[PDB]
From a paper:
Morphology-2 show a width of 10.4 ± 0.6 nm (n = 50), while the fibril cross-overs are hardly visible and no crossover distance could be measured. Approximately 59% of the fibrils visible in the sample correspond to Morphology-1 and 17% to Morphology-2. The 3D maps reached spatial resolutions of 3.76 Å (Morphology-1a) and 4.05 Å (Morphology-1b), based on the 0.143 Fourier Shell Correlation (FSC) criterion. In the case of Morphology-2, it was not possible to identify more than one 3D class, and the 3D map of this fibril structure was refined to a resolution of 3.86 Å. Morphology-2, finally, contains three structurally equal, in-register fibril protein stacks, and the fibril is C3-symmetrical. Despite these differences, we find the interfaces between the adjacent protein stacks to be formed by the same two amino acid residues (Met311 and Phe313) in the three fibrils. The three fibril structures contain essentially the same fibril protein conformation that is formed by 45 residues (Gly304 to Gly348) from the LC domain. All fibril proteins contain arch that is formed by residues Ala328-Ala341, while residues Gly304-Ala326 are wrapped around this arch.
The transactive response DNA-binding protein-43 (TDP-43) is a multi-facet protein involved in phase separation, RNA-binding, and alternative splicing. In the context of neurodegenerative diseases, abnormal aggregation of TDP-43 has been linked to amyotrophic lateral sclerosis and frontotemporal lobar degeneration through the aggregation of its C-terminal domain. Here, we report a cryo-electron microscopy (cryo-EM)-based structural characterization of TDP-43 fibrils obtained from the full-length protein. We found three different fibril structures in our sample that share the same basic fibril protein fold and differ in the number and relative arrangement of the fibril protofilaments.
Numbering used by the authors:
A (entry chain L), B (entry chain I), C (entry chain F), D (entry chain C), E (entry chain O), F (entry chain R), ...: 304 to 348
């Protein structure tokens, strides 16, 4: 169980990610102030 | 069970992601202030 | 069970994602202030 | 069971996603202030 | 169980990541002020 | 169980990572003020 | 004559008082955003 | 004549008082964002 | 005549007082963002 | 006549007082961001 | 007439007073960011 | 007439007073960022 | 062609202009939250 | 063509201009949160 | 073409201009949070 | 073409200009948080 | 083309200019947190 | 083209300019945290 502390940002975040994912399995996520992503990908051989 | 603290942002976030995903499995998500995505992708071989 | 804290944003978010997903399985989502997406995609081989 | 905190946004969100999804399975969603999407797509091989 | 302390940022973060991931398994994530990602990927040989 | 202390940054962080990962297993993450990523990848031979 | 300044609260107040008063004289009051109570109780001996 | 300045709270106050008063004279009050209580209790001996 | 300056709080106050008062005279008050209480209790001997 | 200057708090105050007062005269008060209490208690012997 | 200067606190105050007062005269007060208490208690012998 | 200068604290004050006062006259006060208490107690013999 | 950005005010504006204009040409305007006045006055000599 | 950025004010503006204009040409304007005035006055000699 | 950045003010602006203009040409303007005034006055001799 | 960066002020600006302009050409402007004034005055001799 | 960087002020600016301009050409401007004034005055002899 | 770096001031600026300008051409400007003034005045002889 992870634990994190609260934070307030009044500043001007500018994020410019650009992505291109091609794989047997691929996931892409982009977010701003807050987010929570749990992605388990099991590929059997 | 994850735990996260609350946060207030008064600043001007500018996010410019751009995406293009082509894979056997592919997922794409983009969001702003808040979000929660649980994606488990199991591809058997 | 995930846990997240509340947040108030008075600032001007500008998100400009652009997407194009072509895969055996593909999902696309885009959202603003709040959202919750649970996508499990199991592709058997 | 996910848990999320409430948030009030008085700011001017501008989201400009643009999408084009062509795959064996494809889903597309776009939303503004709030939303909840549960999409499980199982494609047997 | 991880433990983290709260932090307030009033400064102007500018992040410019750019990504391109192609592998047997691939995941991509980008975020701004806060986030929590738990991705376990087990690929059997 | 890790323990970390809280920190407030008023300064202008400018991060310019650029990435390109292609491996049997690959993960990519980029973030700004705060984040927590637990990625265990076990590839059997 | 008391003087007070106006205040606007957009946040989520949660008050959980619980009371049990038994005395020769007893008064109980509970209120939310605004209120004004003038209670003078003179018990002669 | 008291003088007070106005204040705006956007944050999430959580007050959890719990009370139990038994005395020759007893008064109990609980309130949230604003209030004004003038209670003079004179008990002669 | 008291004089006070105005203040704005965007942070998450958490007050957890708990009380139990039993005396010849007793008063109890609990409040959140703002309040003004003038209680004069004269008990003659 | 007292004079005080205005103050803005964006931080997370956590106050945990706990009280129990039993005396010939007793008063109890607890408050958060702002307050003004004038209590004169004269007990003649 | 007292004079005080204004102050802004963005940090996380944590106050944990705990009290128990039993005397011929007793007063108890606890407060957070701001407050003003004038208590004159004259007990004649 | 006292004179004081203004001060801004961004740091994490942690105060842990604990009190227990029993006397012919007793007063107890605890506060955080700002406060002003004028208590004159005259006990004639 | 002028360009201006949108703004939301929740605060208590108090404007107390007072005017008295006597000239060969004279115009007087007073307004609150929003307004747009284009007055061209050409007086030939 | 002028360009301006948007701004949100939650604070208590108090403007107390007072005016008295007597000239061959005279214009007077007073406004609060927002406004746009284009006044060209050409007086030939 | 001028360019300006957006700004949010939560503080208590108090402006007390007072004016009195008497000239061959005279203009007077007073404003609060935002405004844009283009006044070209050409007086030929 | 001028370029300016955005700024957020939470502090209490107090401006007390006072003006009195009498000239062949005269302009007077007073403003608070933001403004943009382009005044070209050409007086031929 | 001028270039300027963004700045955030949480402190209490107190400006007390006072002006009185009488000339063949005269302009007066006073402002607080932000402003942009382009005044070209050409007086031919 | 001038270039300037961003700066954040949390301190209490107190500026007390006082002006009185009488000349063939005269301009007066006073400002607080930020400003940009381009005044070219060409007086032919």
């Amino acid at each position: 169980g992870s634990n994190m502390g609260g934070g307030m940002n009044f500043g001007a975040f500018s994020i410019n990610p650009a992505m291109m994912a091609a794989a047997q399995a691929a996931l892409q996520s982009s977010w701003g102030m807050m987010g929570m992503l749990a992605s388990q990908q099991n590929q059997s051989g």
